[PDB]
Tab-separated table of C-alpha atoms in Angstrom:
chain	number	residue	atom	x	y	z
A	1	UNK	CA	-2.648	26.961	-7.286
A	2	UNK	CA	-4.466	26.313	-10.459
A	3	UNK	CA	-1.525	26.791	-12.892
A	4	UNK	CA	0.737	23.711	-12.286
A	5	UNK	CA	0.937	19.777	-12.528
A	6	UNK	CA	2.745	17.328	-10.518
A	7	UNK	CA	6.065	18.492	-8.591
A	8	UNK	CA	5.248	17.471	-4.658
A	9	UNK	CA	8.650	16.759	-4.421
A	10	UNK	CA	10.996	19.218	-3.303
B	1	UNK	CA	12.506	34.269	-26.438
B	2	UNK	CA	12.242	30.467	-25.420
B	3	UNK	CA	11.452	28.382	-22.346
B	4	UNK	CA	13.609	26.429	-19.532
B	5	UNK	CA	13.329	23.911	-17.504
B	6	UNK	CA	16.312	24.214	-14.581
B	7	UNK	CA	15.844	20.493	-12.261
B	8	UNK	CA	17.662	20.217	-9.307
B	9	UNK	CA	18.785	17.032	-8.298
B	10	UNK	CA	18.337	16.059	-4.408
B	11	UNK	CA	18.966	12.627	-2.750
B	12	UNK	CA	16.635	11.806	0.235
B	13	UNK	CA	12.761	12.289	1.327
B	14	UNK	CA	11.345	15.168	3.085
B	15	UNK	CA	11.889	15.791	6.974
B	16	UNK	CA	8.410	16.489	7.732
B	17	UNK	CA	8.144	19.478	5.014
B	18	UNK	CA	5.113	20.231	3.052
B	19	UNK	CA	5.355	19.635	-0.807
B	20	UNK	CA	5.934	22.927	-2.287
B	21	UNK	CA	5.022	23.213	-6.203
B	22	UNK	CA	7.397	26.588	-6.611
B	23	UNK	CA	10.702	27.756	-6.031
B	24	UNK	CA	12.345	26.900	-2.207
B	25	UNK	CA	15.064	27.532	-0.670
B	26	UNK	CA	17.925	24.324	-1.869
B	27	UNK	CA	18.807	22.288	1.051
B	28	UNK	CA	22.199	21.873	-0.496
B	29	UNK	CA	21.917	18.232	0.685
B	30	UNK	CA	24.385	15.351	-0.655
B	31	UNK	CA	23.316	15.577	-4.322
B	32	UNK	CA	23.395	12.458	-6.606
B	33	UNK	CA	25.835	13.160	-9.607
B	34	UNK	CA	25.275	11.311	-12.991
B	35	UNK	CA	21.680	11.013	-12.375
B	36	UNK	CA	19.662	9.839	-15.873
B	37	UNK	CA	16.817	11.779	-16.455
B	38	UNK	CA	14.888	12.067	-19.786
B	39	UNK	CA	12.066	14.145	-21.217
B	40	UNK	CA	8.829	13.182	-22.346
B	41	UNK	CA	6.490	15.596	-24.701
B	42	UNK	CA	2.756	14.788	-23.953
B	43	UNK	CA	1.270	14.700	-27.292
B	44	UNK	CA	-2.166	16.835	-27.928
B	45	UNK	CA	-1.064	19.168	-25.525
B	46	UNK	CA	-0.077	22.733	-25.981
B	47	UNK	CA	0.850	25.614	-23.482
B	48	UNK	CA	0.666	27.698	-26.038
B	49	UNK	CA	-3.271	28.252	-25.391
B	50	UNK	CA	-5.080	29.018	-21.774
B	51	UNK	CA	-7.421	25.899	-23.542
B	52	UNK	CA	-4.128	23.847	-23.327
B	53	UNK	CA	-3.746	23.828	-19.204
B	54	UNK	CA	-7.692	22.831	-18.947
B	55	UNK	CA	-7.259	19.987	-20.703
B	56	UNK	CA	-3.746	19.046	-19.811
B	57	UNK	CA	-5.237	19.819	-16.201
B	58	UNK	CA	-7.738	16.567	-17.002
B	59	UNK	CA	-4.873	14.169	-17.608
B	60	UNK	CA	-4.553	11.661	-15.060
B	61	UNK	CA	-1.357	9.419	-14.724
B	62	UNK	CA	-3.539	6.256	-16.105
B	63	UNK	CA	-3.116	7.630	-19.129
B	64	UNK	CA	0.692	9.018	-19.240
B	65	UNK	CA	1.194	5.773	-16.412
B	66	UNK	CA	-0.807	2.459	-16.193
B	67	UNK	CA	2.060	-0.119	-16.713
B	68	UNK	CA	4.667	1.759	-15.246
B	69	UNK	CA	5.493	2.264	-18.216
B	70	UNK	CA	4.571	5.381	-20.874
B	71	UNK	CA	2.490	5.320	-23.504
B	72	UNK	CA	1.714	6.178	-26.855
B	73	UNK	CA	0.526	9.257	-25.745
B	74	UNK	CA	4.273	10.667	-25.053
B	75	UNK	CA	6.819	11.973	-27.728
B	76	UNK	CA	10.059	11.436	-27.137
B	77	UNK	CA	11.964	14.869	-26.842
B	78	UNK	CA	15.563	14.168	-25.062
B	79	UNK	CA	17.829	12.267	-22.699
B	80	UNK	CA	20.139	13.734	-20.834
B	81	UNK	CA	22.325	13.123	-17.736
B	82	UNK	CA	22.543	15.945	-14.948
B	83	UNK	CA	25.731	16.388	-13.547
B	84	UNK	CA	26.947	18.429	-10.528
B	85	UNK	CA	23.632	17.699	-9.334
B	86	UNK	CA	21.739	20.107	-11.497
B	87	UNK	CA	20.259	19.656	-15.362
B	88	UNK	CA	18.922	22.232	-17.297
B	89	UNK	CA	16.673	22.072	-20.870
B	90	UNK	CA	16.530	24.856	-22.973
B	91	UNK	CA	14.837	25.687	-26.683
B	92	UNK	CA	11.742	24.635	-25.239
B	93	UNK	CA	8.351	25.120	-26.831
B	94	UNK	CA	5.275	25.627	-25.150
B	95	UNK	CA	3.942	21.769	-23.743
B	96	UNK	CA	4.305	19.431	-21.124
B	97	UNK	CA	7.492	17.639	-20.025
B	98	UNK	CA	7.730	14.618	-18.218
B	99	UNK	CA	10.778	13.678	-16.610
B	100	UNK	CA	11.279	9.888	-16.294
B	101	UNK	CA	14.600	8.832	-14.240
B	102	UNK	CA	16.503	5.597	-15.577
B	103	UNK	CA	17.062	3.075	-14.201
B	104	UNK	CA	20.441	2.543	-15.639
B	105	UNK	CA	23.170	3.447	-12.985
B	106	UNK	CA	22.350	4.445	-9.101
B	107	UNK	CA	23.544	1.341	-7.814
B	108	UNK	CA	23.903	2.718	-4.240
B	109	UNK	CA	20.309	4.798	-4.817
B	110	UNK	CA	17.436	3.292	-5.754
B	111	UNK	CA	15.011	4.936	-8.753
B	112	UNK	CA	12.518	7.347	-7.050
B	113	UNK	CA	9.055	8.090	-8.843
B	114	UNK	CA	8.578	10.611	-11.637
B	115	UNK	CA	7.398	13.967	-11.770
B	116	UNK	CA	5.368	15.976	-14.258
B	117	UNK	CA	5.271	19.587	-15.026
B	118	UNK	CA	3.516	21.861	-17.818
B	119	UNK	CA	5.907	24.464	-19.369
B	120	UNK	CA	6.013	27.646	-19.819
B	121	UNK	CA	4.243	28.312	-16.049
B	122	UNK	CA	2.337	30.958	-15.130
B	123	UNK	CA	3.270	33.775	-12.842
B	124	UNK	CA	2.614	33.316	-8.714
B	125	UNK	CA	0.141	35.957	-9.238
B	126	UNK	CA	-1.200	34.398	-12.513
B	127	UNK	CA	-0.174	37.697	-14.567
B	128	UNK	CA	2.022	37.033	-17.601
B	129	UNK	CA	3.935	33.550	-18.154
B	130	UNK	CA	6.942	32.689	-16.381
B	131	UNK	CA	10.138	31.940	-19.234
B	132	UNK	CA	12.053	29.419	-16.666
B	133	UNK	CA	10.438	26.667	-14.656
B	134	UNK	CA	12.658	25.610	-11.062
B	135	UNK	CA	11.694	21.642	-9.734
B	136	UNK	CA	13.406	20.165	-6.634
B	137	UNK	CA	12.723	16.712	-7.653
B	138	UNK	CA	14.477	14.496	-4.808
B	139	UNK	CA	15.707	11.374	-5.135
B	140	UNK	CA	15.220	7.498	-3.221
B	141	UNK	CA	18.323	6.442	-1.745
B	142	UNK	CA	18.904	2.347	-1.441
B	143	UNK	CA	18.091	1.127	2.051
């Protein structure tokens, strides 16, 4: 994943 | 050229589906209209850099989330209320945005946790830099 933050919810 | 950030607003937890940090398929689910959600620029922080994910990478909610509250190390960008069930944020320079939902309102929902994502993103295949960033961010009903 690397790139990214904090978006679990979908 | 400038960056987006498109949220889609969703009401109720996952039915035994994995988390998914990119773009899904919309359940088209009861959506909450006149949901309150507000963005948060993480100060020292730039997308702008390959530096600037490493050590936004290192931030840990303590620091952007200890009291429940935010910090000092948050500038305050813009409030706005999505309606229809989607928002969407444009003019957006290379960062972090936070999205915090108010309180204020949702009387029949209850306020769900908040969710964090850098912007611009890069590509699946980590070529180039994506111009629009998609979140599902879905919502705690009351009871």
């Amino acid at each position: 994943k690397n790139a990214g933050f904090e978006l679990p919810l979908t | 050229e400038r960056t987006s950030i498109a949220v889609h607003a969703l009401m109720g937890l996952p039915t035994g589906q994995p988390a998914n940090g990119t773009k899904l398929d919309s359940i088209g689910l009861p959506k909450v209209d006149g949901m309150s959600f507000t963005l948060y620029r993480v100060n020292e922080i730039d997308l702008t850099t390959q530096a600037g994910w490493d050590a936004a990478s290192k931030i840990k909610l303590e620091e952007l989330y200890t009291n429940g509250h935010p910090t000092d190390k948050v500038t305050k960008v813009a409030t706005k209320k999505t309606e229809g069930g989607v928002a969407k944020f444009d003019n957006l320079t290379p960062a972090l945005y936070l999205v915090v939902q108010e309180l204020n309102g949702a009387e029949a929902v209850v306020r769900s946790q908040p969710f964090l994502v850098a912007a611009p993103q890069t590509n699946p295949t980590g070529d180039g830099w994506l111009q629009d960033v998609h979140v599902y961010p879905k919502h705690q009903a009351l009871s």
